[PDB]
Amino acid sequence: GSSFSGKYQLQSQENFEAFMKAIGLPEELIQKGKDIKGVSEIVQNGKHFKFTITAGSKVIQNEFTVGEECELETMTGEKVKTVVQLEGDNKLVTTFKNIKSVTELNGDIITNTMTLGDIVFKRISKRIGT
Numbered sequence: 426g427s428s429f430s431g432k433y434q435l436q437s438q439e440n441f442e443a444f445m446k447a448i449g450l451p452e453e454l455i456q457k458g459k460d461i462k463g464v465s466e467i468v469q470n471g472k473h474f475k476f477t478i479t480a481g482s483k484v485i486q487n488e489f490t491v492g493e494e495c496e497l498e499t500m501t502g503e504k505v506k507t508v509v510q511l512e513g514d515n516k517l518v519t520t521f522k523n524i525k526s527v528t529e530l531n532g533d534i535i536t537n538t539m540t541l542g543d544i545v546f547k548r549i550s551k552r553i554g555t
């Protein structure tokens with residue numbers, strides 16, 4: 426079971442700077458990161474997921490089992506204990522630090538929406554071969 430598996434790169438994003446400011450990302454990383462089209466690699470095996478996000482020289486590796494407590498390293502470096510759930514084959518939902526994160530795969534397009542209060546941080550990525 427590998428619905429999400431693959432490599433994807435950022436096409437566009439909305440509200441990057443506002444959101445990164447709100448969550449405590451150092452401004453010098455905010456200034457670098459803003460026009461970076463980061464790459465996400467996802468390995469799904471049934472309920473078990475591994476995902477690696479690359480944005481410049483920064484590389485974050487995460488894993489979780491759906492339905493189970495996991496520890497997710499966020500943008501700042503903060504590690505948060507949470508549960509990631511599937512809502513259908515093609516949608517990953519979690520909440521941490523009052524942020525709602527929804528990751529939806531539609532064919533070759535992944536849409537990631539993080540909302541914290543009124544701020545809706547949306548990222549659209551596209552599959553980039555194997």
Ligand SMILES: CCCCCCCCCCCCCCCC(=O)O
Pocket residue numbers: 454455457458459461463478480481482483500537539548
């Ligand atoms: C130290 C390396 C130099 C550049 C680092 C800039 C910091 C990266 C900022 C890009 C944020 C993209 C990650 C968003 C993760 C997600 O929404 O799921």
Ligand SMILES: CCCCCCCCCCCCCCCC(=O)O
Pocket residue numbers: 463464465476478485497498499500509517518519526528535537548549550
């Ligand atoms: C810094 C990442 C925070 C954790 C995000 C919740 C984990 C569940 C979803 C994992 C998919 C990661 C999103 C990859 C798509 C993207 O880079 O925009």
Ligand SMILES: [Ba+2]
Pocket residue numbers: 428514515
């Ligand atoms: Ba599918």
Ligand SMILES: [Ba+2]
Pocket residue numbers: 506507508519520521
């Ligand atoms: Ba939670």
